[PDB]
């Protein structure tokens, strides 16, 4: 309920921030060129409305989804006369940027759980890019019934298939030809040599 109002506030912020419409034109250009991603500076959000900026610092998971939905709606409203064939409205990724000073990696403790953090470091390993599903469909063994458009959570979180069929127990299987996938990668970060304490081993993330 109130989350819809917050999404509307984000929509108004995106459509109204400026004496030229920075985010509006940036989103239009990115959508036209085919780059479905934007970068948002949180100082601009704080200037427009401090409430949402403060909210983003404590509960990023939900407010990020709300902001993504608002950005998608803004992009849809900006690009009304889209060319024929391109009827499908594609999702948009939102990135964050700020000028705040970073914090040392050694300061990570329990109190920083589920919060937004900024950390400097050096990369030492990068795994290959792989595919992760976002929407999946399943089919039953006996009656061949189908459940479609199951939403998957972001991050390193799995999914549990249902055990009851609305037939033997656990009859569901995943169909590979009807899924949407995105790219993901894993990296290794090491503490900066200039900040490691003397006579102590570095730490990783």
């Amino acid at each position: 309920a109130r989350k819809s109002q917050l999404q509307r506030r984000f929509k108004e912020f995106l459509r109204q921030y400026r004496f030229t419409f920075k985010y509006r034109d940036e989103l239009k250009r990115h959508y036209n060129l085919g780059e479905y991603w934007i970068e948002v500076e949180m100082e601009d959000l704080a200037s427009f409305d401090e409430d949402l900026a403060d909210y983003l610092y404590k509960q990023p998971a939900e407010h990020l989804q709300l902001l993504e939905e608002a950005a998608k709606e803004v992009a849809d409203e900006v690009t009304r006369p889209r060319p024929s064939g391109e009827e499908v409205l594609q999702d948009i990724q939102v990135m964050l940027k700020s000028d705040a000073s970073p914090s040392s990696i050694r300061s990570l403790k329990s109190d920083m759980m589920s919060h937004l953090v900024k950390i400097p470091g050096i990369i030492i390993a990068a795994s290959a890019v792989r595919a992760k599903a976002t929407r999946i469909s399943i089919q039953c063994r006996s009656c061949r019934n189908t459940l479609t458009n199951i939403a998957m959570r972001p991050g390193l979180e799995g999914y549990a298939l249902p055990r009851k069929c609305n037939c033997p127990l656990d009859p569901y299987f995943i169909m590979p030809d009807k899924c949407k996938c995105v790219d993901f990668q894993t990296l290794k970060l090491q503490e900066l040599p200039d900040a490691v304490p003397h006579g102590e081993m570095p730490r990783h993330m």
Binding site: Q59, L108, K109, S110, M113, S114, E200, R203
Partner: protein, 220 residues
């Protein structure tokens, strides 16, 4: 801060019964002392309910106890004082506390469960839907604690000729984390513990228990 230091000598001088019961019943008496200290501090200052909800009580001095070699069956579930040298450190790790679970069928958030260090938390069932299936941890509302593990070896200077130094494991929690560098000489007061799941060798071999020390004070 979140810790308080209490001297055993003064406690023995004032109230003998608490000092007498202290070595043979550390956990419950420490819990009672923590509750009393929290009550007194909250009486002194009321704002701390917003800052810190708990306070730890730590014993500073003790009658010096035998070295790592003499730790045996007589010291089970008692309070001991040892001196040694740090050889390894596992860093800072997050451990669960007052865990809240999210149901899989419905969206009910289960009540907090105390995270004991002996066994893993096993929630019974969801009160509303009465289901007993798998559950997931509510990361947004769960409380977390600091955890660290250290390996301690006897000082080479005090080791008698013809025998090798012996080592033991210790666990630090909350404010004790990151208080010892590797290769440093420390003194600990701790609890000699066995009552944790997986301590008994059962798959094969003799019925041998593994001992782990839970420390609550560090002296450089």
């Amino acid at each position: 801060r979140e810790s308080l230091v209490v001297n055993y000598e003064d406690l023995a001088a004032r109230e003998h019964v608490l000092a007498y019961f202290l070595p043979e019943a550390p956990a419950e008496l420490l819990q009672i002392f923590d509750e009393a200290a929290l009550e007194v501090v909250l009486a002194m200052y009321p704002k701390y309910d917003r800052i810190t909800n708990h306070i730890h009580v730590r014993i500073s001095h003790l009658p010096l106890v035998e070295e790592l070699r003499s730790l045996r069956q007589l010291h089970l579930n008692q309070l001991i004082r040892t001196s040694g040298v740090v050889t390894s450190c596992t860093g800072v790790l997050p451990q669960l506390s007052m865990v809240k679970y999210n149901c899989n069928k419905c969206n009910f958030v289960l009540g907090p469960f105390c995270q004991s260090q002996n066994q893993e938390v096993k929630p019974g069932s969801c009160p509303e839907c009465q289901s007993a299936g798998p559950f997931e941890v509510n990361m947004e509302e769960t409380i977390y604690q600091n955890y660290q593990r250290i390996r301690i070896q006897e000082s080479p200077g005090k080791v008698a000729a013809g025998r090798l130094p012996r080592s033991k494991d210790a666990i630090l929690l909350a404010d004790l984390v990151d208080s010892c560098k590797p290769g440093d000489e420390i003194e600990l007061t701790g609890i000699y513990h066995n009552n944790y799941d997986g301590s008994l060798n059962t798959a094969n071999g003799f019925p041998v228990f593994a001992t782990v020390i839970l420390a609550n004070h560090v002296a450089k």
